[PDB]
Design a protein around this ligand. Structure first.
Ligand SMILES: [Zn+2]
Lengths: 265, 175, 216, 82
RNA sequence: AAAGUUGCUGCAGUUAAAAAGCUCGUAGUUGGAUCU
RNA sequence: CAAGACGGACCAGAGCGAAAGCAUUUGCCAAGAAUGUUUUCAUUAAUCAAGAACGAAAGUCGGAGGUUCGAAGACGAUACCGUCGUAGUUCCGACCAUAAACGAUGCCGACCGGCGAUGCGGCGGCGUUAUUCCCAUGACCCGCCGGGCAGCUUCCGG
């Protein structure tokens, strides 16, 4: 059972269910939350620190750059993936896992990318939120060694490799669906939900595209066949010669009616 | 079981969505109530569940969401949850004197002041919270604090300069 | 440049141009840069015609060859995405580089430790480098610039029409300009490609470099 | 700007311009042969016609006047001239 | 004369003195291109 | 139930009108700008002394009606405020001709940078919708032209 830093951030106390709890030093020494640091000194010390072999870290890097999830994840994510791959290698025979990840299939839809599907607090038609379900609502919820990964990039590459991923709850994950940012200029995807500029081309051109992966290593990723998202309407305006508050004012195009006695900065 | 629905205008859907977490958490952990938001009717419905604590606080929870619909920040509406002597007063600028067109906009700008400064000053003077809509203005506070803030707002829309109202409201707060 | 059957575009050139994402521009257009657009595709991204920027690169290279002294050419970049690149552009020819924050009065205040008198100016980003263009408009200094579609052309004498926001495109175009000036300067020939890979000039993110040496 | 041959504009720019603001002004309209479906005669019809043009032999409605170009009925064929 | 502070040469009329509340309108003033 | 009033929200960087000004439905009347035009006439035009038409609000003469509000005024408190309230506010017919009647900015014509929003008319076009509507049409989308209301930007020049 490999514990990721997201499990430490969410105070996931799963030391009872798993016995092979191993992780790397820099994923636990980079946490900036003081409550996690206080909780780390109370929990029993069954955790062990080790460094993966260079060969396996390298091969993790080649299929990480094959799967297209290369820039989204960091070096600590590489170390976590290498450690869980090594733990799977020296516990179980290595013939179970596979390489050359499957090509992604195309399946468009007419729904808008900002449709609030599978958000718990809303109701599409029933759909009700009780206090008993607050502990239940963490993510999409459905043997010897597992992973306590939280971010979708590591779960995506693990389910692409066929490695069984675990959660804060007892059971494993069968389906994993989320949103990523795809560029429509240079056709490069990024799973970082907070970024606004692209990686390769560098424009402010990323748009929301949904993804869903399974246990078998099959991935399907949905566009939106709505012309509202892809149009250059509010994108050209003359520029003057050279934080999160006031966010909806920027989303208006400048070439539009504002009130006569108000001013944009 | 009791239920209550709060409408959401289209200009408040994105603010409601963005900080929905700190909206549904203080209801389900503190008051023990059971909420949802339907998109077909655009309504936030609150109803009591079995593990309800202090049933005669359901209205308070509704007031919570109601304040956030009017434009108040979630901290001030959470203060509306905690304190019991907190009330909401709403009125229009034209509702006390007929101002048309540019006069109405100048009255709005006099209430706000440069950088919102005048409005912000009144808040720290009166320990209230004021959010003013396109023509509507809403004050959140205790009764006498609402009366003081309403006094300052009514004087600013009379045409009194912001400097005089600033000084007089500081002097009244001193008393 | 001149239809002389030796300075034309090649299939490798267009292939690597489309690989590096140089040809696609921003979302704004300035009316002085309408002649470098091929057309407007419906997605909202202005494409930059490849032969136009090829000829403009050749014109900038002809302007930079014409100076006999490589030491009095200033090459400046304020954004980090070209910063190390212009340093290696110095290793191309010896043109003095300025990377990072630009000191005001570098070109106009003679009582300074850093007071330089170049003869051409080459600029990675006109928007970030507004102060060096302002100071170059005071000392009779001509200007080369790497200009996107959303870039003003004031005090710009040769504007290279390219994507300059992405690291790969700006590093590639610095490498291509260096290859042209070294090709017709006298160092290298045309029968053999330059041994320096384009990826050498590329800016590398610290997040990339903390996991680059992990795969050794 | 500052260098453009006003004597020899590009033809797409001349077709783009207003009909009076060209170098030599010219109309945007044309005359056309119209063939009624119920017959085979030829009728000469202005594109921007304002009157209801009737068939010379069939006495049927050929075009309907509109704010701009005339609307030919369904079934009749047309061919531009010159 | 300075005084381009009487302005034909040669002044002004947003904020300094100053454009009629608006439109029509005879007199007066001015009036497209074209003929060896 | 009745009486008179007034047409909220929609209502805007909107539209129309010579300006003052104009917002419930439907019907009638006659005007009107812009657009489209390989129609017609052929200089019929621009500006205003004299002269004429309209001209917010208040006000004045006569008829009708007075719901609300309300100058003056009568009370009570302290020029401010409250209760009551006359003329007036309302309609019809004549006078008055004044406003910060504002863009504090004559009218007509030509030239002189850019952008994209919007109202109307015209044109061209992939496409989606009237539960994969079985061709057209309305509603959207992209682009162009013309006259507009109105913004942002610029070391055009002043
Ligand atoms: Zn991109």
């Amino acid at each position: 059972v490999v514990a990721d830093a997201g499990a430490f951030l969410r105070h996931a106390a799963l030391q009872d269910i798993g016995k092979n709890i191993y992780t790397i030093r820099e994923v636990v020494t980079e946490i900036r939350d003081k409550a996690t640091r206080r909780r780390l000194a109370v929990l029993p010390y069954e955790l062990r620190f080790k460094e993966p072999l260079p060969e396996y870290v390298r091969l993790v890097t080649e299929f990480s750059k094959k799967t297209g999830d290369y820039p989204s994840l960091s070096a600590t994510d590489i170390q976590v993936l290498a450690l869980t791959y090594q733990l799977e290698a020296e516990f179980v025979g290595v013939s179970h896992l596979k390489q050359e990840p499957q090509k992604v299939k195309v399946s468009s839809s007419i729904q808008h990318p900002e449709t609030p599907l599978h958000i718990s607090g809303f109701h599409l038609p029933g759909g009700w939120i009780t206090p008993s379900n607050i502990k239940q609502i963490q993510q999409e919820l459905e043997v010897r060694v597992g992973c306590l990964t939280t971010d979708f990039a590591m779960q995506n590459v693990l389910l692409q490799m066929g490695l069984h991923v675990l959660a804060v709850n007892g059971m494993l994950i069968r389906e994993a669906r989320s949103y990523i940012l795809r560029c429509h200029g240079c056709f490069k995807t990024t799973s970082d939900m907070s970024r606004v500029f692209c990686s390769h081309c560098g424009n402010k051109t990323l748009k929301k595209v949904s993804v869903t992966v399974s246990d078998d290593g099959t991935l399907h990723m949905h566009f939106s066949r709505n012309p509202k998202v892809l149009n250059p309407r509010g994108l050209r305006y003359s520029l003057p010669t050279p934080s999160t508050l006031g966010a909806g004012r920027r989303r208006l195009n400048p070439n539009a009616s504002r009130k006569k006695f108000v001013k944009k900065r | 079981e009791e239920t209550r629905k709060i409408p959401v205008p289209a200009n408040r859907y994105t603010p409601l969505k963005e900080n929905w977490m700190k909206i549904f958490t203080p209801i389900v952990e503190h008051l023990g109530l059971q909420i949802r938001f339907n998109l077909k009717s655009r309504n936030v419905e609150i109803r009591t569940c079995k593990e309800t604590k202090d049933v005669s606080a359901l209205t308070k929870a509704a007031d919570f969401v109601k304040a956030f619909i009017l434009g108040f920040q979630v901290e001030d509406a959470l203060a509306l949850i905690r304190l019991d002597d907190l009330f909401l007063e709403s009125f229009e600028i034209t509702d006390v004197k007929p101002l048309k067109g540019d006069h109405l906009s100048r009255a709005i700008g006099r209430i706000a002041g440069k950088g919102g400064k005048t409005k912000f000053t009144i808040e720290n003077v009166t320990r209230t919270r004021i959010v003013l809509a396109d023509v509507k203005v809403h004050i959140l506070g205790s009764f006498q604090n609402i009366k003081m803030a309403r006094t300052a707002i009514c004087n600013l829309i009379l045409g009194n300069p912001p400097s005089k109202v600033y000084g007089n409201i500081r002097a009244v707060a001193s008393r | 440049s001149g239809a002389l059957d030796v300075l034309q575009m090649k299939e490798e050139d267009v292939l690597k141009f489309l690989a590096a994402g140089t040809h696609l521009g921003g979302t704004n257009l300035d009316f002085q840069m309408e002649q470098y657009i091929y057309k407007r595709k419906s997605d909202g991204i202005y494409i930059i015609n490849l032969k136009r920027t090829w000829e403009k690169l050749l014109l900038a290279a002809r302007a930079i060859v014409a100076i006999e002294n490589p030491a009095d050419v200033s090459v400046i970049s304020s954004r980090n995405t070209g910063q190390r690149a212009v340093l290696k552009f110095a290793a191309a020819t010896g043109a003095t580089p300025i990377a990072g924050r630009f000191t005001p009065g570098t070109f106009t205040n003679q009582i300074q430790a850093a007071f330089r008198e170049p003869r051409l100016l080459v600029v990675t980003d006109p928007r970030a480098d507004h102060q060096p263009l302002t100071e170059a408009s005071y000392v009779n200094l001509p200007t080369i610039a790497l200009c996107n579609t959303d870039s003003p052309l004031r005090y710009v004498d040769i504007a290279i029409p390219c994507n300059n926001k992405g690291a790969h495109s700006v590093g590639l175009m610095w490498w291509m300009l260096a290859r042209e000036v070294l090709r017709m300067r006298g160092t290298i020939s045309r029968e053999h490609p330059w041994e320096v890979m384009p990826d050498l000039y590329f800016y590398r993110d610290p997040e990339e470099i903390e996991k680059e040496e992990q795969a050794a | 700007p500052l260098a453009k041959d006003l004597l020899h504009p590009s033809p797409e720019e001349e077709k783009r311009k207003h009909k009076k603001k060209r170098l030599v002004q010219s109309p945007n309209s044309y005359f056309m042969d119209v063939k009624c479906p119920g017959c085979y005669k030829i009728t000469t019809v202005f594109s921007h016609a304002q009157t209801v043009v009737l068939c010379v032999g069939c006495s049927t409605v050929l075009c309907q006047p509109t704010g701009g170009k005339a609307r030919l009925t369904e079934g009749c064929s047309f061919r531009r001239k010159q």
